[PDB]
Structures are given as C-alpha cells and as structure tokens.
Symmetry: D3
Subunit: 175 residues, 6 copies
C-alpha cells in the first residue's frame, strides 16, 4: 500500500515523496488517509488558485504539528495523485498560521529521474518566479476560509530542510 | 486498501463513497475488484454518453442484488477514480432492468468539504436538469447492449435513501 | 471576423460577449487584437490563479479606460477562446485600480442557450461563493506585478450593469 | 475567414468540411455564424451525450432545410472547432425529425492527410459500432428538448452522399 | 493491492494486464514498485515521444531479464495508470538492446469488455500503421539516453506470445 | 484575420509568431491556409511524437522553400492554434532535408509577456535538453513517411536567426 513506502533510499539526501495533489490541477484538496492508504477528498478549495508544484509528504515522518513532513516538488509535467517520486531536498518555506508555525519543504526530482534539476543545489538556485508563486499561494489559498490565515516568514537552505527531515524521521519512531 | 474504507463516520447521515467513475469521463466503465481492491476495466461503453455525476459505492454494504450500494455524487470538478468522498444522502432513483429492480442513491458532498450543497436537503432540492439527465442516462446508456433494458420508476426522498443504506449495511454483516 | 460581431441582439438586455479567456484555464492572458481580430497572447499571469468564469468583452463599446466593456460569463463548461456567447447582464463588480474606478460586469447565458440560469435575474441571485471568488481573484491576480493593484468596492445591480453597457455603447458611436 | 473556404477541391469526391464540434467534447453546441464567420455558442446540450465524430458542414452548399450540408468526420484525434479538413464522402444517415426528412453525411479524411481510412470506400466499410453510435446519438441527443425529436430511417451509400453534395452545391449557386 | 492481481482467468488465452503507462500520456515513465504495489515515477522521458498504446505487465510472471512480462494494449481511450484490463494475446515484438534481447507482447481487450477487437486473432490482423508506430517508438524513445540502444528484430504470432506467457508464468513459481 | 498580422513590432529583434501547432499536442499537423487565413489540417503525423515547443511562422516573410519563416516558441503552457505571440529570436536549427538546406528558428516570449526568458539571449542560453529534443524531433518525425527525411547540421546564433528573418522579410516585399 502507500503506507509501506519508505521515507527514502538514503535520508535526508535521497527521499521518496508521496504525491497527494498534482501541480496545476482542479481545486480539489486530496489527502492520503493514514488508516487506509486511500486517496480521500479533504475539501474543495474555495479560492480560484492551483498548487504551483506537486504537493505530497514523506512517509514515516512526524512533524511537531502531528502530521508527516509535507513537500512541494516541481516536475516538468504534473504527476498522478498517489504516485511516489524520488527527490532531493533543496530548501524550506517557513510560515505561521492560525494553528502555529508551519514549514513546507521543497525538493526536486532525483538525478536518476531527470538531469534537468542537477544545477539546483539549494533554495536560492530555484527560479525566483517559482519561489514568489509558492509564497503567494500559501499566503492566499485559504483567504475565503473563515478563521484561517497564513503569513510567510521566509526561506531556509537545504541544510535546514535536511535537518527537518532527520528530526521528523526520528520523532516518528519515538512519539 | 480501498477495501478497508469505512461505510461512513455516522451512517446513514454521514457516509464515505468510493469513486469508480468520474463525472464527464471517457466511456470507460471501471469497477473496484472486491478481491484485490484494484481498479478493473469492467467494459468500454458502447453508447456516446458519459456519467452526469461521479459514480461509486458505499463500502461494507450489500444490496439484494448482491453488490454494494451504488451512489451518484455531483461535485464541482470530476473526482479521481479510486478516491473516497465524504457525503450526505439526499434521495434515490428507483429503476427496473432485465435482472430485476434496481436503485441508485444520490448523495452530495459533506459540509466539511464544501458549503455549496448545504441548501440541498432532499431529492427535490436537486436541480431539475440534473435529475432529468441522470434519469435519461440510465434509461439509455445500455441501449446498444443486446438483451439489456432499463425503465426508470421514479425518485424517493432522503429518508428512503437512508433506509436503504441502513438495511444494506446490516445485510452486509448477516448474509 | 470577430470585429464584425454585434454588441447584442437587443441592448442592454440581450448582448453578445466575445470570449478571450475560458474559465479554469492555464494562466495565459489572451486578448483579441482590435486591428486584426486575431487572438494575441497579452501575457503569462504570474500568480497561480485562474479565471473563475469565462472572460471577455462586448464589441462596439468603449468604456472610460479606453477599452470595450469587459464581462465574466459563468457556463457549465469552459468555452473556446474567440467564441461568442449570447448573454443577459445581471450585475457589476466595482473596483479601484491604479488608473481609477473600474467595473467588470457579470452576464449569464441567454435562456435560448440554456435554462439553468433562468432564475438568476440580479446580483443577489448569483451564488455567494462565486461572487467571493470573483472578488478575490481580481484583488490578487496582479499581486506579483510591478505597479499593479486592485481594491474591490462592491457589487451593483442589473440596472447598474445595463447602464454601463448603454453608456459605453453610446460613447462608442462617437467619442 | 471561414466564409471564404471552398466546398472542396473536386466536388463531390474531394471536399472540405468546416468543423464546428469536435468528437468526444463537452456538450457545447457551437455553430459558425454565417454573417461574421465567428464561432457562436448555439446551445448547451441537455443530455449527457457527446458527438461520436467531429461535426461540421460543407461551405457554399444549401440543403433543403436552409442550412449547409452537415457532415460527421471520424479522425484518430479530435479536431479544433473552426478547423477545416479535406475529406472524401462515404455515406449518409437518413432521418425524419419534426421538420421532415434529414440527412447527415459521413466523410473520412482524404488519403493525403492519412492512410488509415483508405480501405473505407462506402457505408458498408465503416465499423458497425460507429454507425450504431451515430444513429443512437441522433435519435436521443434532443430527448430533453421541448418539441424536438428524431427518428432514424437508415444508411445510404457513397453515391447517395455525393448526390446530396451536388444538389446542395448547385442549389446554393442560385436558389 | 495491485500485487494480489491474478495473471489471468485462463492463461495464456485470457489474461489480466496491470497498466503502468496510458497511451498518449505526458512523457512520464511510471512503474508499479514490486515491494509496495504503489505507482513510482521511474523517470521523465527525454525524447518528445509518447507510448502508442497503454503499457503494463502480467502479474505473477518472470522473464529471463528478471522482470514480469510486459504488454502493450491498444484501447479506444487511454486507461488509468494502476488499472487492470482483461486481454487476449495476439503477438510479440522481438528486440535487442544494450542489456540483451527483449520482447514485448501485444494484447487486445477481451470480448467481454468490447467486441471491437474480435476480428484481431493474430499479429498480422493489427493495423499496419500501429505496428510501425510501436516498432518506431521502441527504436527511438531511448535515443537521448547515453549508452542505450534498441534494434527491432521482428514480430511473432499469437502462439509465440502464449508460449512466452506460459513459460514466464511457470518460471515465476520456480526461480 | 491572421493574414493581416505584422511580421513584428521591430524586425528582426521584436517579432510576432502565428502559432499553428501547440507544444505537447496530439499529432495533428495544422497549417494556416494562406488564401483564407483558416486553420487547415495538413496531416495526421504517423510517428508517436509531439512538438517540444509551440510551432508557427512569421507573417509576411518568404524563405527560399516558398513558405514563411517557421519558428519554435517555448512557453510555460501550450498556446492555442491560431494565436499570435510576441517573441525575440535567439537561435536557428540548420538541417538538410530532401529539398535541401532548411532552418527552423527558435524565439522566446518577449519580456513584456513574461520575465522567465530574460536571461536567454542566444542559442547557448537555451537548456541543452530542449535543444536535443528539438533536433531529435526533426530528425525522426517523418520516419514513417515515404520519400521524407531530415538530417541536422547544427545550431546557429541570434545574429544568424535575425539574418534569416531580414532576408526572408525583404524577399517577401518583391520576389
């Protein structure tokens, strides 16, 4: 099942990301149910926006918020919901919302899948337009949702991203 | 697996529907194989028609025909085959075919997923065009199939729909 | 060509809208070139947003900003860029951008094309979510654009919409 | 513009069909406006059905019902509305609607465009399923439309198809 | 899971093929991970080509190369990745690449799913264009991949295809 | 109509490209008919390949082969056939087909349309993979076509591209 997928071949440099929402899709927020491994409709987004990159999570990880570490993965073509892609972490988007602080990793496809992202080693290697769109999206997609808000803090490097993966992987074993 | 999905959070008012065919899709009739939980191609439809709503079933239910209770779920955008959506039953389409009588439930997305269908509490709240299209579709999609026929009897309210879910849920435990 | 299409069969109640951008499309801002009547790429939008309705204009009209009256037209399925649709105005969204006061009308398909909008006669008849999405889209679509900003002032009625059509049509005759 | 396209390179054997509706498309009935040459939305179909083939007409023809000769053109991939395709007529579907006798030709892409239809020379050469789908589509697409009905009378040959082209072309010159 | 799917109802005449890549899809090479049964991104194809037919494998089979028997299945509409289709083998494409010899089966949908391929009993019944495209695709899709090459040897009949299935099915039990 | 579009706002640095075939589209080779300005189906491609970039031409130019200068335009999203895009030439692909020497320019969207191509000033600036895909596409797209073949000679710079634009534009005035 999707539940038996490893966190990666070699954490934190080489990871697997389970895709829940493809880039440029209809406004349907899917999520893999942790009990069944099936694709559940979380909700229909109320704003006329779409995810700038494919969005998913690393299996076997646990953030302080209680959910697995989520990741944004740009690809040349949108991926299938429920598919798994081998990636390499390059940065992290730090934010704060109504529930506390949050963080989203950005990972690019591994060199075995494509050599198109080999020159991207860190958060500042990503195209500035993409970073602005990802930032803009998170600050506004929940605008029509009563009682919800998001404020982007800033970006952190690949090292901060790797740190988060290792920390959240360990935490998944313990608590 | 898709096989471990509950029938709902609170039957019969709050249910989960496993989607087999999205609304407005190519004429491919998919079905989740009950042995494996995988998406099987049942057949290629012979008529130039498409399902007016997403079509699926409630897991852990058993109709008199021997198959789980099937449901039609309208959404603002077509869903992914194999996805599960939280719904609320609003009516039932009664029919008769070459194998006996049949019935299809109509359920709308739960308020947690969207508030767009909150004003729809019963079968007569559904738009008249949609009801006419659903009716028309079932009476004609199998027209080029030798020895098959369908005759629509009429619609029944939310209470009749809930009754069918409770009855079929119980029946799944017993026989 | 598109330059020869009438403003409507019976202004301001029965109008024709030339569609430039379809609902739920990729972020490509097309525009009909007034000299050639051809579909030109105006720009690639920078935000991850899409038009909640088909977007276009009424031919032979000239609003104060120098361009034809623009309109948003909800349809059950996205239309083709460059197609023309017979509508009935039902409201107007008033805003204030960098230039000054701006207005975007909302028209629904004429009854001869479809019956599902017959009940919508005025702005108050349009679903609240759609109105909120339209407003939110215009407030934020240009966020990542230098020296561009929009502020929404509110919704006005069918009479206010028709007034805009009439004034811009008359203004187009000689001004 | 589309109004200036020839009826064919060598009538009635080699013709040009102006496509108005693509195969397997959303239920939007487009029509080329004869005054402007622009693509107009005729109506939103009420039944959950789609055209089994691309649908259009031969320019410079006038059948008895007042409109150009209409044709269905199967292609391996759906075409663009407003595009023009060189075909070879192979048959005609005869029907009787409310107005009276009606006919819809079937033409296949010319050999210079593709080789996969070379073997189809007459109505008997078209696959049986496709013919059954076309017939079924015309009998039922207007079912949910007031005072509209169609009855299929049968398939006629290539010579009967060409005769219709010729009579309508000649009739168009002066009538 | 996809892992529990049978090789077929009646090998080698009646088989199930698990689909990994749909016909005419974006250049994403997916593969079902044999450990989890999940859809993994194998790689992004570097050439501007697409699979001419849906591509998958027969579960519970083992080729000399160590992987399950792969099959190409033409359908009238592209299938969903991860879906299973009931087929009937009709031929085999023999090839040689940088790793040794290879072979791809061609199977058509079973008559229960569609009667459209009933007249195709063997490799020479397939349309010549399709055979040329399949051949052409395998000889060129890996052209931009350093150190990889493919040379098509030729086609073999249904009997040679059935032989390969039986042999590979047996081999899956033993080694 | 499309026949009245200028070659560019400031040749050869600022040009307009009329798009005939979108990137990543079905294998239908469209062509704008020079007599009517309508989109004609030239042919259905025989190979399972797609154009890696949008493909079109510069109006009012005549290259040596008798046709307008053709160009490939990469965009983040595929464009509509028949649309016009303002570009900036950056290179040319030189080849030798059956007729003789051939050249296909590569132009990127103008900065007023998008900022993501600002850094690309010459052929050396285009990503290597895209250049390899374009070359490979032209070498093989006609493989399954009788008496048709292409051989790639190499990439030339922006100045060489502009020279071709200028010579073909001048040649178009009177030749």
């Amino acid at each position: 099942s999707l539940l038996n997928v490893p966190a990666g071949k070699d954490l934190p440099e080489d990871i697997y990301v389970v895709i829940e929402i493809p880039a440029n899709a209809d406004p349907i927020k899917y999520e893999i149910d942790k009990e069944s491994g099936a694709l559940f409709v979380d909700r229909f987004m109320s704003t006329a926006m779409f995810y700038p990159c494919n969005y998913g999570y690393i299996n076997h990880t646990l953030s302080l918020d209680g959910d697995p570490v989520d990741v944004l993965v740009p690809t040349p073509y949108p991926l299938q919901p429920g598919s798994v892609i081998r990636c390499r972490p390059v940065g992290v988007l730090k934010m704060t919302d109504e529930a506390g602080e949050d963080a989203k990793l950005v990972a690019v496809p591994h060199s075995k899948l494509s050599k198109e992202y080999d020159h991207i080693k860190d958060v500042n290697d990503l195209p500035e337009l993409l970073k602005a769109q990802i930032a803009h999206f998170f600050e506004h997609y929940k605008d029509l949702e009563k009682g919800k808000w998001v404020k982007v803090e800033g970006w952190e490097n690949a090292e901060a991203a790797k740190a988060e993966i290792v920390a959240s992987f360990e935490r998944a074993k313990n608590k």
